[PDB]
Design a protein around this ligand. Structure first.
Ligand code: FAD
Ligand code: FAD
Ligand code: FAD
Ligand code: TPP
Ligand code: TPP
Ligand code: TPP
Ligand code: MG
Ligand code: MG
Ligand code: MG
Ligand code: NA
Lengths: 585, 585, 585
């Protein structure tokens, strides 16, 4: 006849298929806790050591599986600790439900302990942001929050006065709308528009296809289009892996978390097919300043003509549209543009291999990543933190459609490595999971190494210890007039941190130490988490956006300082290859 | 080589096809004013007398045409005046761009005259809410605002420091993305879900199709499904007119702005097909408490199973889906449920006609609306304010697919009658336009009667003068223990108000005065606006949500009282017709 | 034993001595209405025709009396209409309580009719902003709101779900804290800082005392310091009247709502004593660029050295401090700087008088204000709207300590004339009350002329009809490259508007009509409101901030042009008087 409103709320989460959720209890959320406790056989609470890790893990859950992530924080500081993960979810447009503790309705607005108007706190981050005020409508409010978070691909926040979940409500009235759930309709490509797009692309002298994660389901079409038409591919950083990295006409990504051949080719291209792509650097970096024709495919009307004026714009699903192009074209002969890019890619990859293939001496990030490649399973999942590691992982990870990689793409919050790996292992216990993080980012969420131990999540944590915020040091080098500040700091030994949370760990500082340590780590992570603290040099990785290689554009002195610093003696500018095949720069 | 950023902004508006925009100038927006001044041939600025009328008319533009409405307000009080129209646009989910004046960047944050942080003012109402800080990117921010307003069907707000629009920017850099705008090509409704939905609808003993404005393209299919299957039709109030009111099995709308047959039939129905409908009274009124199967068609995933637990929810276009149902069904013979509803509708319409057809005596709202009907062109547009007029217009207006009617559907702001009619006439100069407003609502925006005169917009204004907030008085009668308060007030003579703004006007107070006054008004409104001030009684209109007609549900005393007050002696309850054709309750 | 929570709320208002409050009822606020209905003897509800007039009148209540103003609005559009008055209260830092209707707790967050999260709506405007969620604590939340509004001199907003005020709560639990309210006993101004400030003031060759409304208790000390020390006085515009306008060394105000002698003398001054003053044009106009020493007296630490680098800033009460200065100084003989300023003032006043004293011909604002002066009682209160009238009233009104004048000082919302006068008459039934408004501002709130009639408030409304937003037209003349836009519009006959609301009225357009019309108005306003619609020319009033009179600073051509346009042939620049008495620039 009756049910506790808190029990009904948990039943709503179960109906929506929520397997696990994260947070830290408090008096102000103890009635939700009480309901979770009764339901521990059907829904799985993950106690984190800091609420931001719970929010970040919830966001990563949604990034990985498409299923709404769920986190909670107690009133006041519990909830405000969620912010970095909630902004990550908003900016990476993934569905997250956040429940926030609040004092009972009898105490609200009395200015009692830890009691405040919590609604304005979440107004900016949240697509849906409500304080619940009734027990009987509470399941509906949660159901509504979940449905909107999914539909609008963002954060829903519900502040819950702690009395409400302990109130009895009629057992027969509440329901979940999970049974009615559907994902948004996929628009179809106009046949004439697609034909026009195809003809412009085929007429191009220097075409590129430039895709983002919007083309996630279209890797086959992308690679076959590239092979068939002899058109090089490039991607946003997060879109790495949609087409295998080994594909010889994959240029990489542009800007800074970037590869040399993509930056060079983009500057030369006459026509860009921009697909499922919201590259945030487009305007600020003048990426398309010399592009003659700009062709766009995107499912979101708010994106069409966003990053550049379009010549042809198609409001349709990337894969349906790319298949439609492929179906109306046939094999094209090689072109000078195609060969020039192929040779530039070979040259670039030989550079990266030369860094990876060092066998002894001071450890650099490059060999560490080679060591990851060597122990990586074909379907490994990578949770990557924020900093030099994005750049290094982007260049050195050998990914295929079978892999997943996540980071905080747009909000770019440091600390995401650890929670993303926690979320990865919960959702994919049979898959190998890496947390790749710099020392700065790993420091911010280090306490939740204990969470991997507690729940026996066999993550391979790899910390890149340069005793710097290297990403920022390099920016200060580029822009600041005065000395470096705040970018070089004291050592943390993460093997000792790991020991402290009762996780097996190693610390290495020489290239020659890698094969054996990484083999041990691989074996350990069959059953338990492991940490490798890699003490690396302060070498700056090659800035793809600040190339000094082309004698027509840089002084001989800058060229040689560049080659020496970046061990890039064998790199050729794209212009070398353009000239070989009879094209001018 | 160079162009003023302000001039570029106006070119962005023109590229998106903005015909007219509303506001009041101020020093903080005089640079936008300056650009508008040079572009009078291609964009038409409408100076309103209160900025709320500008915001409300911009919302109405979007309601009528589907094209973005555009308004502006000077810094501080100019912008804050917009609020009621901007919330109207948010709640009625139509695209509106609001430009807000701001002091120049050299004086911002100086606590100077009328200078404040304006961004937090618009955070809640707006889908997109930004302060421009650069002239060169200003055209792009305006373009982004428009593109987001359309994509998210809501309000975009841009605060513009007044220095920026007078700064020169490169002539060749800015662009509009209007050229990329398109509507999606949707797939066909899934065959198997539609088939399943159809079987359940057809298996019902007491089916209803209950549509909202999501089915605005489906009038033809709705009426044919109804006729073919013998299923009565009911709608949300705003969906009145999608199927002609004369259709014998149109029941009307439910709740309070409602018609008796819809409320009665809905209580009896075993299956409801809920199509393109977001009826906000569903849960609070327990509308579907007796429904066995609830079937849904909606284009928005956020709506799926929102209003009631749903047996089958089809994510699809309403018209495509209704056409798909119609293609798989054929004639069913008349049923008792069909005949009972037809007889119930006949009885209700005779009641309404008895009120309209009074020829002499104290004027009531009923005869006023009959007089509107008599002078109405088949494609007239009606701007309806908020109060008893929603209920009366819903019952009395004889609408067809050729009509439009708009009001403030969900935010329900009083005062929308005047601005809605201004916008209707600006968009449709050759169509007859009515403003039907209560005295309370008309007085809120009365100054903008002068805008109709200034711009020669031949609106027919009909003000219903009861010297009451009638809608609220009746509520107070129902709920309040103590005397009426704030709901009976002093007369305003709107014929004299109209005379004050130099608009021709009449004041009437007897039924027999209607024919000639309305004939004169019809004629005047061939060239100039006109106002009829109708002094009506304070009779409470029959409450469709508080029927006292059925012997089984009400005492004889209560029924005789209800029949007396509401001149309802010849009204029969639905149960009478159910019994007549052999059904129980 | 029990009391309705709503009844308790009204008792809280009564305990704090709230005499009258404003709003428009709605279903979402009908339970507060119900409590008000039972308490008509002790609290006076004023039903306005637009909720903005309620908010603005509540702000005016606080401006006039120092006691909290109280208004309300129904859920959604009722509350949002309050905004312009609530921002006025925030910016003019006066206590206002705004009650907002909300749907009952059982329907909140259900997306029902006119139901939204209202809390974020009021976050920016409000010092205190809460949604009540419990009936038993509701009286306390109202008490907290009032107490905070007073303490923080701003707006408190409470959203009240309509069910709560009809719930019974224990009769003995609730209380008001009005009994605890007091004003602080301040220490005396520190002796040594005041002595130091005095020496610097007295050492100056060209001193000015520049006061704002923080010195409203110090009129006597200000005038005596001026007379004794031979130091001219200037004020902020709102501080007009603290020292009688007839005082021969009152220079007026600076900037645009300004008088020539104040602008001229300020440019010349070597020491300024800035007292109880937060002049917002200080920095943007570079008002003190030539000042050698800047001395400050203010009660608010947040103001200390805010507007200019300050040599000595005394944190103290203005009156106590000015009395302390006066106690340590004695007579100084007339100085050249004193005589030059006196002569400059005489010359300016003769100019203003030449405009006022025209006896026949086309009516200008100048003669209208002379006609107001002639019928004004010595303790008249003036509600002034926003536009040219601020400038004209500032120059022409002959005010003394016995007068009050209010406007929207800083938010400067048009429309405040009507509500300010309603509030003035409600607080001071035995004092003569004027509303001086431009046609633009009067038309924004014109419907509430009916409120003056309904409540028998004998306001003298004077509408200045130029068929322009004159203030803005003159700005466009100064800044805009293209034609005037949005600043010249169609006539509204306000005598006919007034007739429409059943208020006696006159329309005048010639100077010779003034005496008899104003005599009739004075008489009518012994018992009933009256309106005079003054059709004035579109002559630009002399710009005190753009003087062209001094041969050393302007060309002969520019001076002759300025003298012609502004009828300023007999005006002399300050430099003439400086030279006359032996000073340079
Ligand atoms: C430290 C750091 C530095 C970074 N710097 C770089 C950098 O230098 N270079 C770089 O490339 N990235 C960089 N980023 C990542 C970057 O900020 C952006 O997140 C990324 O470039 C955007 O990638 P995207 O367009 O693939 O993803 P999103 O921004 O998520 O956009 C996806 C797009 O696809 C559309 N879409 C979705 N589904 C479909 C469909 N079915 N069909 C068609 N369209 C669809 C969406 O509407 C959207 O427009 C960096 C990240 C970090 C952490
Ligand atoms: C004073 C006043 C009183 C009122 N009281 C009543 C009342 O008593 N009774 C009443 O009926 N109304 C009343 N309303 C109006 C009411 O508040 C709601 O706005 C109305 O009932 C909702 O109508 P809707 O569902 O048609 O519109 P919306 O709420 O706009 O819903 C449209 C729905 O259609 C969907 N949709 C849009 N396009 C498509 C498509 N192509 N295919 C499929 N689905 C689509 C949307 O996703 C959405 O779910 C009143 C209004 C006022 C001013
Ligand atoms: C259309 C329009 C144009 C305007 N333009 C002008 C103009 O050109 N010229 C002009 O002068 N005004 C103008 N204003 C008014 C202007 O915006 C400012 O509001 C005004 O100049 C500020 O006056 P104030 O410093 O007296 O008041 P406030 O800003 O209220 O400042 C009061 C100050 O006194 C202090 N204070 C309060 N009590 C005490 C005390 N007991 N002892 C000591 N200090 C105390 C406070 O801390 C504060 O610093 C205009 C207004 C309008 C409507
Ligand atoms: C929470 C947070 N603080 C600051 C930043 C800015 N930021 C980006 S990268 C970076 C440095 C990362 O340092 P580290 O993790 O040690 O990586 P490294 O570049 O040294 O490999 C900083 C401080 C950020 N993105 N997130
Ligand atoms: C701005 C605003 N204030 C209050 C309300 C609440 N409200 C709804 S209807 C209504 C009465 C309208 O009175 P009137 O226009 O005279 O219509 P009537 O019912 O008398 O015909 C009110 C006050 C509202 N919707 N909008
Ligand atoms: C609500 C609002 N809108 C716009 C402004 C900007 N503004 C200041 S004065 C003014 C003109 C006022 O015109 P009017 O009332 O006719 O006075 P006039 O100068 O003609 O005498 C305007 C539009 C404002 N302060 N408030
Ligand atoms: Mg580091
Ligand atoms: Mg009325
Ligand atoms: Mg004017
Ligand atoms: Na108004």
């Amino acid at each position: 006849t009756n049910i506790l409103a808190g029990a009904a709320v948990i039943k709503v989460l179960e109906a929506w298929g929520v397997d696990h959720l994260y947070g830290i209890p408090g008096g102000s959320i103890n009635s939700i806790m009480d309901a979770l406790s009764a339901e521990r056989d059907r829904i799985h609470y993950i106690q984190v050591r800091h609420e931001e890790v719970g929010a970040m893990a919830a966001a990563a859950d949604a990034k990985l599986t498409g299923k709404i992530g769920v986190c909670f924080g107690s009133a006041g500081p519990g909830g405000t600790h969620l912010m970095n993960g909630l902004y990550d979810a908003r900016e990476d447009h993934v569905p997250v439900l956040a429940l926030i503790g609040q004092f009972g309705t009898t105490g609200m607005n009395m200015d009692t302990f830890q009691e405040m108007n919590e609604n304005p706190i979440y107004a900016d981050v949240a697509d849906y942001n409500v304080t619940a005020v009734n027990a009987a409508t509470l399941p509906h409010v949660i159901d509504e929050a979940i449905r909107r978070a999914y539909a609008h691909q963002g954060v829903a926040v519900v502040q819950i006065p702690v009395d409400l979940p302990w109130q009895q409500i009629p057992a027969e009235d509440w329901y979940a709308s999970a049974n009615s759930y559907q994902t948004p309709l996929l628009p179809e490509p106009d046949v004439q528009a697609v034909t026009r797009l195809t003809q412009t692309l085929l007429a191009a002298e220097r075409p590129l296809i430039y895709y983002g994660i919007g083309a996630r389901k279209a890797g086959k079409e992308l690679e076959q289009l590239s092979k068939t038409l002899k058109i090089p591919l490039m991607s946003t950083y997060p879109a790495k892996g949609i087409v295998a990295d080994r594909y010889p006409a994959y240029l990489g990504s542009a800007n800074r978390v970037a590869q040399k051949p993509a930056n060079e080719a983009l500057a030369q291209a006459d026509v860009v097919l921009f697909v499922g792509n919201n590259y945030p650097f487009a305007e600020v970096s003048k990426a398309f300043k010399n592009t003659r024709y700009f062709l766009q495919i995107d499912i979101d009307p708010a994106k069409l003509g966003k990053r550049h004026k379009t010549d042809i714009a198609v409001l349709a699903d990337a894969q349906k549209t790319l298949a439609a192009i492929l179906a109306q074209v046939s094999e094209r002969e090689s072109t000078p543009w195609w060969q020039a890019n192929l040779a530039n890619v070979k040259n670039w990859r030989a550079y990266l291999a030369s860094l990876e293939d060092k066998q002894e001496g001071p450890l650099q990030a490059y060999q560490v990543l080679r060591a990851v490649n060597k122990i990586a399973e074909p379907d490994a999942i990578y949770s990557i933190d924020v900093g030099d590691i994005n750049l290094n992982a982007n260049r050195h990870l050998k990914l295929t459609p079978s892999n997943r990689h996540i980071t905080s793409n747009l909000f770019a919050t440091m600390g995401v490595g650890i929670p993303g790996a926690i979320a990865a292992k919960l959702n994919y216990p049979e898959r190998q999971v890496f947390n790749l993080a710099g020392d700065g980012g790993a420091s911010m969420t280090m306490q939740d190494l204990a969470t991997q131990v507690q729940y026996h999540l066999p993550v391979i944590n790899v910390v890149f210890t340069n005793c710097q915020y290297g990403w920022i040091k390099d920016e200060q080098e580029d822009t600041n007039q005065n000395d470096f500040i705040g970018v070089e700091f004291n050592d943390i030994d993460f093997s000792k941190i790991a020991d402290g949370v009762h996780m097996q760990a190693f610390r290495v500082n020489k290239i020659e130490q890698l094969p054996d340590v990484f083999e041990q780590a691989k074996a350990i992570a069959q059953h338990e988490p492991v940490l490798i603290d890699a003490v690396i040099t302060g070498d700056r990785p090659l800035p793809a956006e600040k190339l000094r290689l082309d004698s027509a554009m840089s002084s001989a002195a800058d060229i040689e300082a560049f080659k020496q610093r970046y061990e890039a003696q064998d790199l050729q500018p794209l212009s070398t290859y353009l000239k070989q095949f009879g094209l001018d720069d």
